[PDB]
């Protein structure tokens, strides 16, 4: 009979200091550990409950202070807990020391204390051991009070062979030759931090280091053959760390900051205090082969983790229900920091795709509020979704633009200083914001309306001369009674000046000083809502876009497109009028509106490919190509221009070459011929590399040649482009081979499996293979990627969310229901089901309409 029955830990036993000794054996893939945890008790008890998972406990003692007493061990695998029973009840106010000896073996997965391998340039395979403890994986490496609220200090000691190199959260204090033939590294003691931030790495990495203007030792570790790609990472890391220190007015508390490129990683990165971990693709930059997209991604990722150093590490959420207080703030500090440190990137151009893609799912009935209760690890992993990142950052952007940027900065500085080295709830942020908003600004109620209910509002705007009527309702892809405090912003045809109005009720009205030709709400996509215009409003905006699209901003044009199509999804606008608005892209030239038009148009022919709709689908693809043909023709085949122009060129050339624009196809075939005859030695323009590989991979010869180069390539961008090209094939046998080998993890590492599966589910001849593979290997995939993880969500959605028929809907429902306790309760499952339902509705309503509209559009030249 186990003396505990709740998933949460007892509140009356608090740890204060962990002392960890880990001996990891790379040859036998084992490790023995000793954990000494100093605790205090507030209620007299003889039972100590803590976390432990897949760890063999062999010995347990309890020291008082002199006196040491044995503890009896009880195990609960369902709750991932152990209970330690003490002969004499603990005395309140006294410090005790629990000492546990345990053993286990490096996880073969992507979490806990797991193994990674890398290939040398001589073909040899080398092994290292890394950590990934967020959210509840520290218990797989050391028994502890594995919750973010039980903060404590950590004194770490790691045992290794001499041939190895050990790094952790703190600097290395000393090395002692314990026993014979293996060294023991004693690291400095950490600060008050949560348990999920513990990390340690045993490898043979090389490193590059640099000093900040504040004296912190910033270093970047990687495998020996890839250390020469860490320069941009290190430089941007120093710049962003100095920026964050200066901005928050709070120095970095640790002596050193490390950025390690792990060969086997699940997430993009991890914010381990003093030892951030990354994907090699997400940290390393090769000037010869990496793309401008890759450079921007590295910059944004480094900014994200260095922001986590404050939002998450210094001030941590108390429970995983408010994980957005970490993740949304970090995703927003990405923008706030990079837009200052690397202004040549101009991240304000590409930020709001996050808000749009987040609305795509938050408009669903299965969506959840930004802050929602969770208990078990599957739910906690599910919390790392588009809401907590994208929607959190978008509502934070809206709040910072409603308040002054100066007021937002003062609020966040007060927040971090008041709650440093502690935990916060959702309400502490609103308290810190209301301590600054004193012009009649109740931040609390507004942000409660934005964080405590799901979805986002639709604002309908009616104009009767000089009167502007505004009505808010809950946008829901088919009546609840939700209400927001929407800080509306708008401009008129008579003024580029931004006028504001705070809509706190269902309907309201303001008075213009003069009649206007058009009015545009949600200026610059700084608000997390969508806008509909009554009467001839959409016609007026269509005329504006087709006449002088430069009358409004790039973000405004993108928001117009996205809002038009999302309103088609609920009937406030016809699909025909939406496409009439889309026709303006024939003269569009900016990256954000073009990319938004593509992101809103591609899913339609993606839905059509899954059905018998060849004529209408071909008409649609031809129309899409003819829409951008002028811009595609004007695009050059070089690496010229800014980062924005380079990414635009790459995507345009890839799109044209995929949809069979014969000039693009001919030139890409020529480049691929010259390259293949050069044996990969010819340097191709990184921007056109995607299109060249995608064209060359259509034939079996070029496909096999590309794969032959894949094994030995060392550029992560080159690897990703090769993956995309190989997934673009029509050979079912090769698709099956890619799937199986990326699953096995030998020829293609498993970290790339979810993206490869998603691309193959996009493939018009591969989607049954992807769906069937996910179904038939669900068990091992779940064991590898954890339940409810963003990887599982990505796989499920990439394999199913393009289905459009009731037969497919029943397939999905039946399979995920028969899964029972192994994934039937997945929020991603519910979201895919609702997405398929909305796809069915949208297809039954708009497909034949689109066919008629395409015939009408061909009858236009
Ligand atoms: C992980 O486990 C492996 C295997 O149990 C350990 O390898 C063994 O390590 C010991 C001590 O280093 C070796 O003994 C010594 O080998 C050297 C080799 O020149 C010899 O000169 C010494 O007199 C002594 O025999 C042992 O040979 C070696 N076994 C083999 C064949 O690899 C490894 O050390 C463990 N790593 C740690 C520190 O956890
Ligand atoms: C990873 O480490 C664990 C230990 O933490 C290894 O567990 C060991 O597994 C073997 C094989 O199952 C166990 O032997 C078994 O004994 C049970 C009855 O006690 C018997 O029913 C089984 O048929 C088998 O003979 C062994 O007991 C267990 N560890 C301990 C200390 O009991 C595990 O094998 C390691 N990883 C892998 C992949 O093996
Ligand atoms: C690029 C940048 C924003 C870094 C960031 C890493 P972190 O700093 O948000 C880390 N703390 C995630 C921790 C984690 C790991 C595994 C399961 C759940 C939670 C990221 O990759 N975001 C992606 C991908 C992602 C987040 N959680 C994941 C969990 C599994 C797989 C992928 C992900 C996103 N926008 O979600
Ligand atoms: C949304 O989904 C839930 C199931 O969790 C269902 O009970 C509810 O009825 C759905 N929406 C509506 C229209 O009520
Ligand atoms: Zn994060």
Residue numbers in the entry: 46 to 110, 115 to 527, 533 to 915
Which statements did the authors publish about this structure?
The endoplasmic-reticulum aminopeptidase ERAP1 processes antigenic peptides for loading on MHC-I proteins and recognition by CD8 T cells as they survey the body for infection and malignancy. ERAP1 is a member of the M1 aminopeptidase family, which is found in all domains of life and plays numerous functional roles. These proteins contain a thermolysin-like domain10 (domain II), which holds the active site. The M1 aminopeptidase family has a conserved HEAT-motif-repeat domain (domain IV) forming a bowl-shaped C-terminal structure.
To examine the effect of active-site occupancy on ERAP1 conformation in solution, we used a tight-binding tripeptide analog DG013 (IC50 = 33 nM29), which has a phosphinic group expected to mimic the tetrahedral intermediate that would form at the scissile peptide bond during catalysis. We determined the X-ray crystal structure of ERAP1 bound to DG013 (see “Methods” for details) and confirmed that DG013 binds as expected to the ERAP1 active site, with the enzyme adopting the closed conformation in the crystal. The binding pose is similar to that of another phosphinic peptide, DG046, bound to ERAP130, but distinct from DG013 bound to ERAP2, most likely due to lack of an aromatic P2’-binding site. In the presence of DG013, ERAP1 Rg decreases by ~2 Å, an effect observed in multiple measurements and for two independent protein preparations (yellow circles). Fitting the ERAP1 + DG013 scattering profiles to molecular dynamics structures revealed a cluster of models consistent with the experimental data (Χ2 < 1) with theta between 54 and 62° (yellow symbols). This cluster is distinct and nonoverlapping with that observed for ERAP1 in the absence of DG013, and consistent with a conformation similar to but slightly more open than observed for ERAP1 in closed-conformation crystal structures. In the ERAP1–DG014 (open) complex, (cyan) as in previous open ERAP1 crystal structures, Tyr438 is oriented away from the active site and moves to interact with the peptide bond transition-state mimic phosphinic group in the ERAP1-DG013 (closed) complex (magenta), in a position analogous to the previously determined bestatin-bound ERAP1 closed structure. Reorientation of Phe433 and motion of the helix 4a is coupled to rotation and tilt of helix 5, which repositions the side chain of Tyr438.
